[PDB]
Structures are given as C-alpha cells and as structure tokens.
A = this chain, B = another copy of it.
Amino acid sequence: TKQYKNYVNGEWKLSENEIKIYEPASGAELGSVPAMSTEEVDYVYASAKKAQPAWRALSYIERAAYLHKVADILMRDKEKIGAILSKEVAKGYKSAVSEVVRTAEIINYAAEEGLRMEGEVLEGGSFEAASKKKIAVVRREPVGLVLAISPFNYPVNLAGSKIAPALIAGNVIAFKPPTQGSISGLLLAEAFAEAGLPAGVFNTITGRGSEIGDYIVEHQAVNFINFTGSTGIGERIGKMAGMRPIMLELGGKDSAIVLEDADLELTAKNIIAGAFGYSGQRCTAVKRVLVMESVADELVEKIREKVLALTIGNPEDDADITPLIDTKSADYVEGLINDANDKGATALTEIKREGNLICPILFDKVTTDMRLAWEEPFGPVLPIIRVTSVEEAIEISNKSEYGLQASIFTNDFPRAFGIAEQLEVGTVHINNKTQRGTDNFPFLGAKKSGAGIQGVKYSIEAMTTVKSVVFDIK
C-alpha cells in the first residue's frame, strides 16, 4: 500500500526491506514502514551528532519557535493524522484526534517551559570562610542525542512528551515509534519536517526488534534513552544503558482504595472511566478495586449497571470498548479471565470474545490467589477485592511490584493524606480516578513501574545536565 519513509538528515528515505502494517480492528493493510538496517541506524546517529552543535548554538527562543510551528501544523492536520492513528491502533477516532491535540499542547508547553530553565549562582562562603570570594555560576546544558521510544497505545502523544522537552534544551532526537504505530509516528515526523528544523536535529527510526532492538540502545552515540513500554524491555534497556541516563515508563496496576465514608456514586463513575478507557489499554488506570466490605455490595452493583452502559464496537464508531491491539494480547487477557473463574471469582457481566474484541467484564470476589489481582491485563477486565481494613488495603496495594498511581475514595482528607504517604506509588488522586492528567504535574512510578520523573518541567531537567564555572572575585 502506501510506502512510508523515515526522516533522516533532512531527507525522506525508504529501506530495502519493509514491514506491512494492518488495522487491529479489521486486518486491512494500512501501509508499510521501512525495516532499517544497523548501517541505516548508524547514519541516523551520525547525522544527529553532526547537527547537535549548531542546534545547541541557537537561542532558546529560536528552538521554541520551531516547536510552536510543529504544534501548529499538528492542530491543522489533526483530522488527517487522527484518521490513520485510529485505524493503526484500534483507538476511537475522536480519541485519536484527542491524542494529536494533546501532543500539540504538550509540545507548546514544553517550548515555553524550556526557555525558562534558569541557572544558579552558588557562594563558597556558605561552606567555608576561606572560599568567600569563590562563586559558582551553574547553567543547564543538553545531554546530546536522545533516543525516544513511544508505545503503541499513545505512539504520537507519548512521543511528543519526550521529543519536545529534549529539543528545547538543545538535544537532538532519534525517534523510534512502535511498529504498530509507526505510520502515525512517521506522520508526526512530517510536522517536524515541515516546521523546517535543521537537518539532523530530528530523525526517525523504524524496523524489527530482532534486527535493531538492542542495537539502537547499545549504540555509543546515544546519550539518553527515554522509553515507554513493557517492563521486560525496560529492564533490558536499563542494563544496556550501562551508566547512561534513562527514563522508563513501564506497567501499572493502579489500586482504587474505597473507604466506608466514600461517595459511592462518584467512586463508581470514576472507576468506570478509569478502568475501561481504551479497553483498559492504559498504564495509568484503575486496575484493581480494594473496597471495604460494608460498602462493597453497593459499589459493585453501581459499577455493574454502568459497565452495561458502555458501548462496544469499532474505532470508527467511537465505541468505548474497541478490539484489543492484537490476538496475543486478547489471548493473554482470556488466560487471566479463566484463572479467576477457575479460582472462584464472579463475573457480573458477560464474558464474550469476537475476534480480539472482548466485552467489558466486572469480576467480584477476586482473591490474592488469582493472577488477575496482580498482573496488568491491558484488557477490559476489572477485579474487585474486598478488604476488612485500611491496613489490609495498604498491604495488598503495596505488595504489587507496580507503583504508578493510586486512587483514594473517602471524605476524611487528613486520613487520605496519611494513606497516600504509605502507598508505594508516584501519584495519589483523592476522590478521582488515576491519570497522567495535566501534563505539568509530575508523572512517575515506584518499584517496577519505571525510572525518572516525567511531566513537562521534570522531563526537561532529566534530559539536561549542568556545567559549573567557578572563579574568584576581585
């Protein structure tokens, strides 16, 4: 079909071999992306390295100007990009357009945030009297070449969240979108190409993991690896990074702790939106409800009728529950469903699969003995775990190897804050479903959920180092 090309050193390049991409919801051929060689990756890196000095030499306002233009182009082509993105990752069309819009928003915000990254002046006299004439002028500097790897669920948005912060600070980029999402990633590249950023500043890489997977990370040209994906690959990247800085956004199994004094209707609505969005294919999402026994029956019934209201179908029809990314993912989800059922869990909503389209399932009576209580499904299945104390909810919650976010539903805020402190997660939302939401806020995880702090200002400081110049006055 349409043969897409990689953007390398200001030029569009096809490769000798290609990878055909198909729509998860229909199997229809979407087009093809290049299957790059290691030699081709070498060229991308060499081009970026050559271009970095001149890019860093520009003023901050000039780099922000380029980024603003990119965002403007995305807004202009949001329908065009959204249409393909919707088809490529089986995401509802309007939701796909939303991803592009949020990408433009983050890119603009990072542009303005990045030009406000001030330095500091330190006094020697603060530490020792003899060094009172000694001052340190410390300023921020880019790390060099940043390798950005986006995920299939947010191939464009979670690409811009890494790209914009890196670029504003003077770093150059090598963007590797997920294969299932590479066409959308190359469409994102078109915006950078049209914006006119100097050749070599922004480049893209597409190909098979077996061929270039480790190669792109182990390459000595790369000064920083910013990745969103599976924990297994994140672990491997950490090792391959060696001593080089990294940022990892891995899995999540966000717990929603529900106390006896919680607004059950508000809780139920939040749990529904958080758990079933994009068919549960989101890292930050309610994946387990730890509810006090006395209010469990009532909450569960409220959630059951709300699950029945969810639409199920195709991405072009903006259905709440769309087909999962692939067959293997759907099979994995079933294994979890089977395990729970076999161990005694109660499916309160119909268990049905058509192709890779699994209907939303509410599982009550879920125990810690079930895989569903621990493993991230990335499917439309929600387990309810009944607890008898806040202490139990906290131990169950913390036992997870994941620690992205948590939700606390209660009307006792001081208590909510105390519980929040004990929870091994990056962010705790009080009376609200978990969310990366409001991109200026920090986004991070504890334990196996990741490494490094995201959020615009934080991602900016992460991909920058400092240069200290010390001298004596008089």
Contact = CB atoms under 8 A, between A and B. Distances in A.
A61 B428 contact: no
Interface string A113-131: 1011111111111111101
B120 A119 contact: yes
Given A60-B125, A129-B62, A438 B474 contact: no
Contacts of A118: 120-123, 126
Interface stretch (A231-239, A354-362, A378-386): A231-239
B441 A468 contact: yes
Contacts of A123: 60, 115, 117-119, 139, 440
A60 B129 CA distance: 8
Contact of A243 (B138, B238, B427): B238
A125 B59 contact: yes
A417 B126 contact: no
A231 to B, nearest CB: 9
Interface stretch (A71-79, A191-199, A317-325, A445-453): A445-453
Contacts of A412: 411, 474
Interface stretch (A27-35, A174-182, A272-280, A429-437): A429-437
Contacts of A125: 59-62, 115
Nearest to A240: B239
A137 B414 CA distance: 13
A438 B117 contact: no
Nearest to A132: B59
Contacts of A430: 469-471
Interface in A276-333: none
Interface stretch (A81-89, A339-347, A368-376, A418-426): A418-426
Contacts of A112: 112, 115-116
B138 A121 contact: yes
Interface residues of A, number: 85
Number of copies: 4
B432 A131 contact: no
Given A118-B123, A473-B414, A466 B444 contact: yes
A437 B124 contact: yes
Given A411-B411, A427-B470, A126 B440 contact: yes
A65 to B, nearest CB: 9
A260 interface: no
A223 to B, nearest CB: 9
Nearest to A458: B466
B441 A124 contact: yes
A428 B470 contact: yes
A473 B421 contact: yes
Interface of A: 58-62, 105, 109, 112-113, 115-129, 131-132, 134-139, 141, 234-235, 237-239, 241-246, 248, 411-418, 420-421, 425-432, 437-442, 444, 446, 448, 450-451, 453, 465-474
19 contacts: A109-B127, A112-B112, A118-B122, A124-B441, A131-B437, A134-B437, A135-B137, A136-B427, A136-B441, A238-B242, A239-B242, A243-B448, A244-B451, A411-B411, A417-B474, A428-B468, A430-B469, A432-B471, A437-B470
